[PDB]
Amino acid sequence: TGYDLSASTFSPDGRVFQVEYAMKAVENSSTAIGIRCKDGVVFGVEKLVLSKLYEEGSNKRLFNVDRHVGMAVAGLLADARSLADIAREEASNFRSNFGYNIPLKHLADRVAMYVHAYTLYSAVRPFGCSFMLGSYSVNDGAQLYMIDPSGVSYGYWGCAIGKARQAAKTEIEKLQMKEMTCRDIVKEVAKIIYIVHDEVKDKAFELELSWVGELTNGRHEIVPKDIREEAEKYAKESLK
Amino acid sequence: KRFDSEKAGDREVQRTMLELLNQLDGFQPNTQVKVIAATNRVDILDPALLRSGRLDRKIEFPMPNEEARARIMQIHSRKMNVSPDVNYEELARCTDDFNGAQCKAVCVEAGMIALRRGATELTHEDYMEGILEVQAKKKANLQYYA
Amino acid sequence: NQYDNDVTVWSPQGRIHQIEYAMEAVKQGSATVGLKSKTHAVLVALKRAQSELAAHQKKILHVDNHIGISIAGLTADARLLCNFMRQECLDSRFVFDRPLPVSRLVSLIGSKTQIPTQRYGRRPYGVGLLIAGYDDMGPHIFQTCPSANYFDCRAMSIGARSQSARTYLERHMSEFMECNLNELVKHGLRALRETLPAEQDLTTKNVSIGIVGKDLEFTIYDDDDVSPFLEGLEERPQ
Amino acid sequence: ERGYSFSLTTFSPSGKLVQIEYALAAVAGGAPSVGIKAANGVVLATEKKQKSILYDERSVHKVEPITKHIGLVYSGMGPDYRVLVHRARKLAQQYYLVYQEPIPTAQLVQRVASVMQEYTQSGGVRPFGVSLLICGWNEGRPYLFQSDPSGAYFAWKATAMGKNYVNGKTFLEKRYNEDLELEDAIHTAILTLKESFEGQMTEDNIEVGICNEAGFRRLTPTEVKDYLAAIA
Amino acid sequence: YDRGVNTFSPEGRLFQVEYAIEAIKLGSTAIGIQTSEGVCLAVEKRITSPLMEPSSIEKIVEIDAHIGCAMSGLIADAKTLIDKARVETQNHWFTYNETMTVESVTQAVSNLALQFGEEDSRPFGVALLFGGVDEKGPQLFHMDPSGTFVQCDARAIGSASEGAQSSLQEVYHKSMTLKEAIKSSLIILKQVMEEKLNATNIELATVQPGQNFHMFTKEELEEVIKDI
Amino acid sequence: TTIMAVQFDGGVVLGADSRTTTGSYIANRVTDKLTPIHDRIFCCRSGSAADTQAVADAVTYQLGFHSIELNEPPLVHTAASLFKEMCYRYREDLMAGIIIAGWDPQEGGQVYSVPMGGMMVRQSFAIGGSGSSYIYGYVDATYREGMTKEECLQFTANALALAMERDGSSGGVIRLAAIAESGVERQVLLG
Amino acid sequence: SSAGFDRHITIFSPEGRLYQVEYAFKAINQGGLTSVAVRGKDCAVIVTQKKVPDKLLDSSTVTHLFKITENIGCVMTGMTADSRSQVQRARYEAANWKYKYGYEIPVDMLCKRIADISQVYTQNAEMRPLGCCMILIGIDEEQGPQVYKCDPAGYYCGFKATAAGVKQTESTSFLEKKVKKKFDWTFEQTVETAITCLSTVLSIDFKPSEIEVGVVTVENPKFRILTEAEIDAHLVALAE
Amino acid sequence: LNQMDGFDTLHRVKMIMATNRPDTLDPALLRPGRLDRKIHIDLPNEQARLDILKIHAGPITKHGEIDYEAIVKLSDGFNGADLRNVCTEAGMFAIRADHDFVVQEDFMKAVRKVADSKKLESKLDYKPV
């Protein structure tokens, strides 16, 4: 009774339901996972075809924040694009005062600080977004971070967002973190995303794979789906 | 179960519910004759209701999907005379937040204005019409949006 | 329903009803269908008036030589975001002395519409914007929403019973990328003409049409300008 | 903030201030403390007891002297207390910078009283839950003052803040009187704070600050067990 | 359900604005007419007592030389729009040494129609009608509290708005003449007034390309009365 | 005044004079121009002393906070970058005799130069101050590539000695700073 | 005993209570964590365990011990994002101490400042009380080691051996019995107790990987995080 | 209460009592004499969970491969009941696979997922003392 309204307010259980609602609202978005190999980080997204509806290659939740750092987001899309402007400008500031690549830890810490800062006040709402963050450097290696609408910033070798989450990150234990090269994890995550998410739930969908690491020399972009085209080849035969 | 005294006027009734938990607890013989339960809202519960002899398989029943919505609504209209031009795609997408029961209401209204029309057979303009009828409500006026 | 008070509140299901009611504000506007080919891009909009002598209220309005827009919803925010749009145009058109690529432009629309979608005691904007423009990669047809999430299409529509216009779209819209401007325009009015109940036109003054092309600057066409586009039409069946 | 800033304290049907009443109750639930102004100077005696023997009383003090001639105690909630103490600490300085002279007790209570007053009516924020007992020695004659959540102030030869303060108040009415030396004031202050004290009293169970006309002084647990050993 | 005054309706739209649309239904009724000869507009003052001085009521003030206007419902809310619009036209005459067109004053008001909010105040409850002569001649316009604008030929507002628009679109056409539209309008006006027609009850707003300004005056009106 | 920074294989070597005066009057017989910003990064300053101390303290602040946040050692280029920022920002107001050098875990010994204009450049060795004027020509042909730490110490000692001998401002005594992986080593020489 | 908005905002109840802070002190236990602080003669020891649900978790990212300054370590409780914001506020304010005054902060005045900041967090009715708790250590001149605990009531305090959180209320009851007697304290004595109290409270008796030991001493005055190896050495040392 | 306040010797009779919440029981029952002892059940430790999982793995025929530490790592905070229903959920999910002996991979899948559904329906398990 009124304890769900403002994020400024506590509750008889000692938490905020604004964060709970926002959290479980992110769960309704399409499943987008990520994983990191020894030589880089493999982002992957499943974008749904609803009616037609419109041109392919639009509103992709895969973003590029920096030359070496990009987004794979899920949840409310507008707030996620806003967060892409946020981190974009933050990397511009680090580049401004210092002039080299932002260590992923500090970037995720700043975004975590904002996301936290919007959970304390009834002026704004808690953010409806949860995204993957990954980067690579030779003085660092392949790092992956997972950020939640509450503002907790930690890291994984791989993580799972969207409706199918636990059942999707389950068999990711079969994917080995170091031993497996990234060019193989392309078709690995392809087979996870294609094999998970039963086609009756959504009649048609597609697969998007973005990638950053050593093979591209630190550049973060989509490893082109027409390049290797290994999802469909393997994933279609992988249903059995 | 409410909270604390006094008083739960159902404390005897919910007490009988905890007696059902005794028939599921201190006595096994209920292993025969499976008993099924249904609730429109899971808001309030006996938290002890979680068990295989107690509530086990728990399934969320969502809003039907446009495929399933046009399917079940087509099952309600399959007996009635329908002019063989219906998308079910157009109105399947026109079904937003609908309950399948409001798809039934779409059929029922289709027959309703199908009456006043005098047309012996149901038409698609009648479908979208009844859709507008039941949902969403009314009314205001057409203005300001040009 | 008290949790639908303002934008700030997340519903028990996690859906702010303010943006939903803004969508329902968009659905009340007069239908319009934008579309593009592999070369040319066209949008078509139908006016609605208050009475006889009252002028049919226009939708399509020119913005920049390479970019026009359609509209639905509140005329206030329409002219407002339109002004901010002129601004954005003359910005790069000033400093960079080049036109504006549509993509980054519409992301600027999303950033401008974003903040009112969150802060306490704020509202979104009732918007039926349909954008058509040419950067170096040619035609674009976008669309907006009160939630500030934009889509890129070959053809989309908003307003009253605009999904029926899409049910006309699906069939021929693989062909819409081929034919030239004229018959593409009559494909467009073939998409709008079902948004009307079948007992009325589809006249001259009640409809607004706009076309832009690769080497063709965006121009609004109405009345005598659409009379060539409205002629040579086969009437809908009965 | 959000600029709402509306004072949450309205007037009751009788005109009383609800939140100020409740803060007065929170002070009444504060720690038992006392102070006595007599003869040579002022003697403030509070009570600080640990909820667990892990606690170390050499760390935080209940007595925070504003200047060498002026101390201070309190009852109620330390969180607020430390805050307004930092505030008054800073505030005496501006007076100094102007006149190059120690600020008089009366003037301290004036300015802090105003800070607390406006702090009640201030925008969208509760009042304090602290009632201060301020001591000081100026112009040969010492002084003892008392604040309240509403900002009002008075003066006493002796008083009490916290639980039982009416009872121990009446005890101080009869027993304490006249003007008597620091030794006597300390004695009867240890009696009256010995009233509501637990079954055992130690040097760390209480704190005694004294205002001589030579200047304020904070006593150590050494002297605290010295005079009280031999309690009362 | 008291919510933020900025909240959309479930159908829906802004509450207080849609209510301000109803705020005009009770105000004073008026009828303008656009005809190639010129724009003629008319209002009923709705006078109560002999205390009430008849010339002190004006629902029509001439904004610029070539621009008149009418009001409805609340008045001192309209005063600000009127004056500030005069300022806008005069600044247009500053920059461009010409006459701000009747159509650009419209959006020069309706663009600032809804600025109201708390942070970062109440919407205006007055309808307006714009008469004037631009380069295309007589123009009659109509605007609403929400800022939505449409150009009309013969438009009504107020309490009589509905039936006056019915009988109006009944008696209208594009071949009208000036005084024909004047007397045809005061026919509806004297059907929609409770008290008998006199010189005080109404005032006429008339503008023509070369016939100006005008404005209008009584004792011409006092003749137009008996001209019926 | 006069300052000298040379990078050898395992790190860098800094040295500077002591005497700092105003006009004719001998102000301070000994004054240290090497400021330990961080454990592995020093800087040698000239120009207005107060500006150098203030800027150095400010970049000590922002730098120390930044490195505490990093949980990692800072970079030499990161240390000079802030000096470039604040210098170019106030380049109208202040004076920069600042030259920065230090050993880094990643890159080893590095040297960076910041003249009054506010630009930043890395060189094999750097020189600043009013005394360096006469020593450019000597030190240029006297230099040799592939200097070990000892040759650097003796080298810089000769250069600074000649500097302090000819110019009147540079005087007093000589302080040396040897920065490497093994840690900072200082001393004070005469003769 | 409640009337009006007092359960939703920060004011006084009919009895003088305010529900927000008591909702915070139980808003700490959501983490299900255990914080243990023990002070020795010349040394001070911190120990905390962690939960690793996934093999994708990086052991280095979820570490709950944070180093504010060279000589100053700390440990948090409660929700995470609040703890991080607290941590950057801490480090920030320490650095401001070094900039203003030029000498190292005693860390006690740091608990005073952070505490007052928490009070400002309790004051405004339109802001959230931020229910994370904070514990610190450090070294001071002739004070040896110290411990302090800042809680979101707007106050600070520090003692010999202190613990606050889920199961820590009984760990104090075990503690007071361990501390006295007369017990004197060496380094391995206070480490050994640092394990014992958590053991007898939990009795999991487990791998050294789950617990994290923070330490400070006057031999090396700097704060230090222990490597699992030496930890396991103390672990087979305390098992006789 | 008055028959436990005797006036009578209840030495020879024993009384065992079980309820959801030890809150509404009144100080009369909460008073010793009438109620001498107080003992509770707590959420089973992963050790006891391990054990009860062992005895629940007995009656169910299984594939040669069995690893209990998988379920012990995954299952946290369940009731003992919820754990045996988790085992039954494994087997009855394995009637779809139609295998007689069932791998513990199917147990990890169905046990894990459906168990976490039980934990989403685990709302308000926190009771007084």
Which residues, other chains included, contact B78 with Cβ-Cβ below 8 Å and sequence gap of 6+? none
| Residue type present at position E159 | S
Backbone angles phi, psi at E204, to 5 degrees: -105, 140
Count the Cβ atoms, other than its own, within 10 Å of residue C95. Answer: 8
Q: Which amino acid is at H112?
A: R
Q: Cβ of G91 and F71 within 8 Å?
A: no
Residue F1 annotated among the catalytic residues of the structure: yes
Q: Could you tell me the two tokens for F112?
A: 């960076």
E154 in contact with C at a CB cutoff of 8 Å?
yes
Q: Are strands D215-218 and E30-35 parallel, antiparallel or unpaired?
A: unpaired
Nearest to B108 by CA among B87, B79, B136, B83: B79
Name every chain B residue with its beta carbon within 8 A of the beta carbon of H85. Answer: 50-52, 56
Cα gap E69→E60, rounded to integer Å: 6
CA distance B33 to E163: 73
Provide the 3-class DSSP secondary structure of residue E227.
Answer: coil
The amino acid at A82: S
Q: In this complex, is the C-beta atom of B92 within 8 Å of any C-beta atom belonging to chain C? A: no
One DSSP character per residue, G124-159 reads BTTB------EEEEEEETTTEEEEEEEETTTEEE--
Calpha distance D129→D76 (Å, rounded): 6
CA separation for the pair G71, H71 (Å, rounded): 43
Q: Using a CB–CB cutoff of 8 Å, tell me whether B141 touches chain E.
A: no
Q: For residue C115, give both structure tokens.
A: 């903040």
**How many residues can be counted in chain H?**
129
> How many Å separate Cα G223 from the centre of its chain?
14
The pairing of strands A204-213 and G35-39 is unpaired
Strands of the sheet with F99-104, listed across from one edge:
F41-44, F99-104, F108-113
| Pair of tokens at residue G152 | 């979101």
Contact residues for D223 (Cβ-Cβ < 8 A; gap 6+) = D208
**Residue A61 near residue A74, CB atoms below 8 Å:** yes
Q: What is the CA radius of gyration of chain F?
A: 16
**CATH number for position D120:** 3.60.20.10
**Given the structure tokens 């930043």, which residue do they identify?**
F120
Residue type, E119: E
Distance of CA E136 to CAs A2, A189, D112, E97, E206, Å? 60, 67, 73, 18, 17
Report the distance separating Cα C190 and Cα C184, nearest Å: 9
Instruction: Output phi, psi for G228, to 5 deg.
Output: -55, -25
Query: In whole angstroms, what is the distance from residue E4 CA to residue E13 CA?
Result: 13
Q: Is the dihedral of CA G21, G26, G31, G32 positive or negative?
A: positive
**Residues E43, E201: Cα–Cα separation, whole Å:** 9
Name the residue with tokens 């400008």: A89
Alpha-carbon gap, residue A111 to A104, rounded angstroms: 11
In sequence order, what E strands does E45-176 have? Answer: 60-62, 67-70, 128-134, 137-143, 149-152, 154-157
Give, as one character, the DSSP assignment of residue D27.
H
CA distance B85 to chain E (A): 30
Calpha distance F132→F17 (Å, rounded): 11
User: Strands G43-49, G35-39: parallel, antiparallel or unpaired by DSSP?
Assistant: antiparallel
Structure tokens at E177: 């003449």
Please, are residues G89 and G124 in contact by the beta-carbon 8 Å criterion?
no
User: Cβ contact (<8 Å) for H20 and B48?
Assistant: yes
Burial of A47 (0-12, 13-18, 19+ CB in 10 A): middle
On whether the CB atoms of residues F179 and F164 are closer than 8 A, the answer is no
What technique was this entry resolved by? cryo-EM
DSSP D167-197: HHHHHHHHTS-S---HHHHHHHHHHHHHHSS
**Nearest 5 degrees, angle CA B102-CA B108-CA B110?**
105
Q: Which strands form A141-147's sheet, in the order they lie side by side?
A: A62-64, A70-75, A129-137, A141-147, A153-156
Of how many residues is chain G composed?
Answer: 240
Q: Which distant-in-sequence residues (6+ apart) come within 8 Å of A221 by Cβ? A: A64, A70, A210, A211, A212
And the tokens for E140?
């009659």
Report the distance separating Cα D177 and Cα D175, nearest Å: 6
Instruction: Tell me the helices (H) and strands (E) count for chain G, helix number first.
Output: 6, 9
CB D134 within 8 A of CB D72: yes
Q: Record the tokens describing residue B134, joined without a space.
A: 């039941």
Return d(Cα E89, Cα E68) in angstroms, integer.
12
G95 in F contact zone (CB under 8 Å): yes
Closest in B90, B125, B144 to C167, CB measured: B90
Q: Look up residue G25 and give its two tokens.
A: 């002190």
Amino acid (one-letter) located at G226: L
CA dihedral E9, E15, E18, E20 (to 10 degrees): 180
The H or E element containing residue F189 is: strand F185-189
Mutate to test the interface with B, among H56, H123, H125, H126 (most CBs of B within 10 A): H123
Range of the domain at D43: 1-232
Closest CA to D56 of A132, A103, G162: G162
Q: Are A160 and A72 in contact (CB under 8 A)?
A: no
Three-class DSSP category at E64: coil
- Measured from the Cβ of residue F102, the count of other Cβ atoms closer than 10 Å reads 30
**Chain F residues close to G88, C-beta within 8 Å:** 69
The Cα C116–Cα C147 span in angstroms is 10
Token duo for residue A227: 């390049």
- Which long-range contacts (C-beta less than 8 Å, at least 24 apart) are formed by C202-208? C202/C230, C204/C230, C205/C47, C205/C56, C206/C46, C206/C47, C206/C48, C206/C49, C206/C56, C207/C44, C207/C45, C207/C46, C207/C47, C208/C44, C208/C45, C208/C46, C208/C47, C208/C58, C208/C59, C208/C60
Q: How far apart are CA A143 and CA A101, in angstroms?
A: 13
Burial (CB < 10 A; 0-12, 13-18, 19+), residue B56, is middle
Q: Strand, helix or coil at E109?
A: helix
Name the 3-class secondary structure at C95.
Answer: helix
Q: How many CB atoms lie within 10 A of CB H98?
A: 7
E165 in C contact zone (CB under 8 Å):
yes
- How many Å apart are CA B134 and CA B102, to the nearest integer? 7
For chains F and G, tell me whether 3 or more CB atom pairs sit within 8 A of each other: yes
Query: CB–CB of C50 and B94 under 8 A?
Result: no
CB contact at 8 A, C131 and C107: no
Strands (E), chain A: 32-36, 40-49, 62-64, 70-75, 129-137, 141-147, 153-156, 158-161, 204-213
Domain count, chain D: 1
- Residue F64 CA to residue C125 CA, distance in Å, equals 47
Does residue B82 contact residue B46 with C-beta atoms inside 8 Å? Answer: no
**Distance separating the N- and C-terminal Cα atoms of chain E:** 53
Closest CA to D163 of D138, D122, D131: D131
Cα separation, E109 vs E93, in Å, equals 17
User: How far apart are alpha carbons F129 and F98 in whole angstroms?
Assistant: 9
Structure tokens that stand for G21 in this block? 């802070």
Cα distances from H101 to residues H42, H59, H61, H65, in angstroms, run 33, 12, 5, 10
Q: What is the helix (H) or strand (E) element at residue F43, kind and residue range?
A: strand F41-44
DSSP single-letter state for residue E54 = G
3-class DSSP state of C90: helix
Kindly state the DSSP code that residue G162 receives in the 8-state scheme: B
**In chain A, what residues touch F85 (CB-CB under 8 Å)?**
97
Q: How far apart are CA E151 and CA C56, in angstroms?
A: 9
Active-site residue among F1, F2, F20, F156?
A: F1
Inter-residue long-range contacts of G60-67, CB under 8 Å, 24+ positions, other chains counted:
G61/A154, G61/A155, G62/A154, G63/G212, G63/G225, G64/G33, G64/G212, G65/G212, G65/G214, G65/G225, G67/F68, G67/F71, G67/G223, G67/G225
Distance from CA of D217 to the nearest CA of G (A): 22
Q: How many residues does chain F have?
A: 191
Closest CA to G128 of C118, A6, D120, A114: A6
Contact call for A116 and G85, based on CB within 8 A: yes
Residue ranges of domains in chain A, CATH in brackets: 1-240 (3.60.20.10)
Residue located via tokens 């009731």: H79
Provide the token pair at G171.
């760990």
Handedness of CA G51, G56, G58, G59 (dihedral sign): positive
3-state secondary structure of C135: strand
Beta strands in chain G (DSSP E): 35-39, 43-49, 65-69, 72-76, 134-140, 144-151, 155-157, 211-217, 224-225
Tokens at H104, concatenated: 């513990």
DSSP state of F10: T
Cβ–Cβ < 8 Å for E47, E177: no
CA distance B8 to B1: 8
The total of other beta-carbon atoms located within 10 Å of residue E136's CB is 9
Distance CA G110, CA E213 (A): 78
Euclidean distance between CA atoms G64 and G77, whole angstroms: 8
List the beta bridge partners of residue F7: F12
Alpha carbons D143 and D155: distance in angstroms, whole number:
8
CA distance B146 to chain C (A): 5
Q: Which two tokens stand for residue F45?
A: 């300053």
The amino acid occupying position A155 is: G
- Cis peptide upstream of residue B136 (ω within 30 degrees of 0): yes
Helix (H) or strand (E) holding G90: helix G80-101
Residues 6+ apart with CB under 8 A from H86: H71, H75, H78, H111, H114, H115, H118
Q: Do residues D43 and D34 make contact, with C-beta atoms less than 8 angstroms apart?
A: no
Length of chain C, please?
238
**Nearest chain H CA: its distance from G180 CA (Å):** 29
State how far the Cα of F102 lies from the Cα of F41, in Å rounded to an integer: 4
Nearest to E215 by CA among E76, E40, E93, E96: E40
Helix axes H104-120, H80-93, angle to 10 degrees: 130
Say how far apart CA D188 and CA D206 lie, in whole Å. 14
- Under 8 Å between Cβ of F131 and F4: no
Q: Kindly list the residues from chain H whose CB atom is less than 8 angstroms away from the CB atom of residue A195.
A: none
Phi, psi (degrees; rounded to nearest 5) at F126: -135, 155
